[PDB]
Amino acid sequence: TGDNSNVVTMIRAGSYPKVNPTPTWVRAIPFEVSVQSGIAFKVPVGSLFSANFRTDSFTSVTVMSVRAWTQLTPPVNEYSFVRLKPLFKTGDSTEEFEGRASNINTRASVGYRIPTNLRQNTVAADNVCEVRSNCRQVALVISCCFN
Amino acid sequence: DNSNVVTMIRAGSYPKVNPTPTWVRAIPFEVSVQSGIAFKVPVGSLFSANFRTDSFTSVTVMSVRAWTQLTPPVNEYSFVRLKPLFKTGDSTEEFEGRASNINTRASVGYRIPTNLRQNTVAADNVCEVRSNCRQVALVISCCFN
Amino acid sequence: RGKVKPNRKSTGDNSNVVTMIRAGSYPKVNPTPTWVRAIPFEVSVQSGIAFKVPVGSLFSANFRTDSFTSVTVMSVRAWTQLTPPVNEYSFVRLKPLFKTGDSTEEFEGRASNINTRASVGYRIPTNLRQNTVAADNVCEVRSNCRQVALVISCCFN
Amino acid sequence: NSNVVTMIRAGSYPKVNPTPTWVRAIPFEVSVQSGIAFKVPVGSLFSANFRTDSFTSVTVMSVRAWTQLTPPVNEYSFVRLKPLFKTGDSTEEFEGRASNINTRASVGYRIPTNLRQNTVAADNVCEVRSNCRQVALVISCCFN
Amino acid sequence: NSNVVTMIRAGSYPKVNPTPTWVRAIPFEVSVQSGIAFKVPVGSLFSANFRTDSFTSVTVMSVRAWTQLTPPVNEYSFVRLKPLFKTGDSTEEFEGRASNINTRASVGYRIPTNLRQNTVAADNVCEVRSNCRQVALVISCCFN
Amino acid sequence: RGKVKPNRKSTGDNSNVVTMIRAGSYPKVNPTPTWVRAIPFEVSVQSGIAFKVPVGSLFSANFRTDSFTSVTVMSVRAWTQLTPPVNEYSFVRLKPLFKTGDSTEEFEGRASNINTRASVGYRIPTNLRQNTVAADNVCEVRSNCRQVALVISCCFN
Amino acid sequence: NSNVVTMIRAGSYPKVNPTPTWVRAIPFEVSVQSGIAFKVPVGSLFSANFRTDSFTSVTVMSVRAWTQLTPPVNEYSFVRLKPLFKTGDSTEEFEGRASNINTRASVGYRIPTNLRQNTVAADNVCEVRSNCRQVALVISCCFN
Amino acid sequence: EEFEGRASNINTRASVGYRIPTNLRQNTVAADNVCEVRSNCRQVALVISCCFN
RNA sequence: AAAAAAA
RNA sequence: AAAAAAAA
RNA sequence: AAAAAAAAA
RNA sequence: AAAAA
RNA sequence: UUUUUUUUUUU
RNA sequence: UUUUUUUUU
RNA sequence: UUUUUUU
RNA sequence: AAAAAAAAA
RNA sequence: AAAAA
RNA sequence: UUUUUUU
RNA sequence: AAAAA
């Protein structure tokens, strides 16, 4: 109804505009990490830069929120759990944001938001957070802005 | 927003995710053009690391805008023409724009109606450019997928 | 009231002589306050090579910003300061740079008249507005014109 | 709000001024002898201690004074201000006295718009009298 | 109303000024020679005859003039005023003429706020011209 | 907006320092503009004879009207400048004069007190307000008083 | 707000407290044995793992319990809670069962305001019974 | 910046304080420094409003 | 409602 | 909805 | 709400 | 919402 | 702030 | 009334 | 308005 | 109305 | 309602 | 509000 | 409706 045409139509363009071949890009990047029992795993910021995510052209990224799900079943007799400790170059946190499953067959999950005042860039050498989980793998979805 | 520290998120089930999403983009690039000769613009010029788009193999072109990128010949006013090209059938429209000041760029563009917005691959061509200026700058509004 | 007298200040904003100020307790003072500023300055650029703009350029007599050692940059605007090569329309790119991580943006503006300055700028989000010292960099500049004019909106502190 | 950089569709090159003006409250102290008036020099307003050394002229709007040290024994602090001007010094002795010996005396005065001309380092703002040996000043002024 | 004294629940010692300012209309005459302009000295404003001798500087707001003596034979009185300023004398000849020989000529002029700076005894307010030998002046001014 | 900074102009009509003016294209100027003026001057008259007032009297240092060679006269007012003969009440007549044709009007005013100036004037209709040069005349003046004061409302151009 | 530091016109020194109170939900687990009640020690709430090693007393508000491990074969998880109080233990057996063997049982109880006195590490919150060999507790309490 | 505050009674404390804008509210570890303190008084009491994490 | 045009 | 520590 | 893109009497 | 009663 | 040429679907 | 921690609907 | 992100 | 006296969230 | 058009 | 005074 | 942003 409110459609347009079935043919090409002239554009009365004007002065050459402002342009940017390499713009920013708000993204939710999904990737997994392996975790050993009882040992915290530091999540490298570098996992976010990759051709798998179309983000290999970026070197910096502003992480906004971190969410995590256990990716494999827990040990026998156990309910899946997962923890997150936010890491920041200006000072690591000591928080242990933990989510557990209520059904052994179900993923545990938890996440944390980064306040605006702590949303600085990070590079591949930097770490996002420590992860702990009685499951050997953890799936993460990181809401981050690539720039 | 007024918060100053990390806060828990009571996340739930694992979400539907997509590591290689689409991206709506305006891609600026330039092409060399010879006097009196038409130059087919390759769609492959849109897939390059310079645009963060080498990971794409297809692109739905929406609109095309061209500006003369160099001065015109002596005594002449810049001008640039576009002939949209389509795999299903090239057009014959010559959307032409002429500068009214010799020192000023000549610009023109054309929109692709929804019914012709299919994907194009690197080997495809967007449109034929013509111009008395040896280089034409192009801004192509397109959807990478 | 319960009047005294003196003075001669005629109706509010129309006094012709000095008038006493019933000042009170010594206030909170600051001899060295901050200063939000639009700093104009130029940088030289070679065709094809990036030039990292030092934050130190902002601290200078020419700007009165001498006493400062740190600055919070808000936005950066750029103009080509010189004509372009023959046959060319001016252009200028800006790549923001941060200590926590350099960006890969190339905010570019081009002139539509050869005689006219190409211009472009970019805003720094609040979450990236930390201080920067002289040794720090602001942005990479590229330009077919040999000199680029910059105006940097920042807060000195 | 925005979490990444955003382009600024800037335009023509604007009107700039690398050396803009500055309205300031400049605090500084002066030494005062008993019974002797001290001519406060305008030059004390120019100094890197205030970021104002890049200035050579200043428009004084108002002047406020507080005694900076205790008064003599048995005495309540006090301070006087006599506005001075290049076109003609005034004879007003704007006085303020403490009502608690342990507390500062203060007082100040406003300069009408018609007397707000520039002054230079050589010039004098006002005479200051006080039974206290030091007087803290805060001068509202426009550096230009 | 009250017919006896009543206590005043006074409080802390206020801000005082023994030598305050004063806005005044100062009348005084000046001797004028035929055809010759007379520079009216600002010093005539300072005098115990006006209670203003305690002042050394004064801000002039407006100046009014009247012829103080009769004019020549066959002539109507007249008076001229040319405002004088330290930053730059003016060239206006504000004139007023009597329409009845037996009556005074007058005229005056207002000083804009931006030219109301202090003046001292040495300075001159304005030139005065008149066919009458004396000119009565009334100067609205602020003594400070 | 999209802010810069500097300055210190406090609320409209209360600035204490210089403030930048974002001037633009060079305007239309005029170094020698017109000037509408009330020109006072006196003329001498003999009892019983008319005196043609020259327009040149208006161009003079004493009026700042030096640079002008032409003037459009709007209205002419006249006053007797000196006392009348013994026993007489002052009087003054004005006969307007024009290059296209002198008028035969004698606009006359008389004093009702011997001590008082007789006064009179006349307005020139728009359709007679052409320019006049020094060699031109304005009006004939008559008066039992030997000197007549004139104030001529005109436009210099 | 702004992008730079701003002065705070602070006043008199305020009332301060270096060791304030803290309202918390303390998660921790306890080992349980089949058919045997386990008394939960309040002392479990005082640990550097919870940032509460600095507290020596705590007011318990509510107690919620989940089975932390799978139940025996062919059984649905269940957990009971028997509140305990120094002034007098309760006999309530607040019990929750799982309706899906693979799902946590859960239950909890509230402590009325009149029974919310302080407890120390030696005291006991409640008895826990369960067919599961570990029970996860989350105790809402005010550390003081 | 030298945010200064003085007492108007010799027997009374001088105070002053400052706020950190949001764009400068990053974390700080023990090694870091908050602010320089100057005073003609031998001991300055401080009250720092902060967010531990 | 699409397209070429027109103030 | 509320309580506790902190800002306004 | 953020990010990229996209127009007329 | 940076800097003066 | 009411106004050409060819198509044409619903109303 | 906003930030942080916790219950309640 | 259309894409990616979070309420 | 004058004079003396007499208070809180 | 003391002192300036 | 209560005393002394006058409307 | 003569002369300044």
Ligand SMILES: [Cl-]
């Ligand atoms: Cl299930």
Ligand SMILES: [Cl-]
């Ligand atoms: Cl381009």
Ligand SMILES: [Cl-]
């Ligand atoms: Cl041009």
Ligand SMILES: [Cl-]
């Ligand atoms: Cl008064």
Ligand SMILES: [Cl-]
């Ligand atoms: Cl400003």
Ligand SMILES: [Mg+2]
């Ligand atoms: Mg051209």
Ligand SMILES: [Mg+2]
């Ligand atoms: Mg269980």
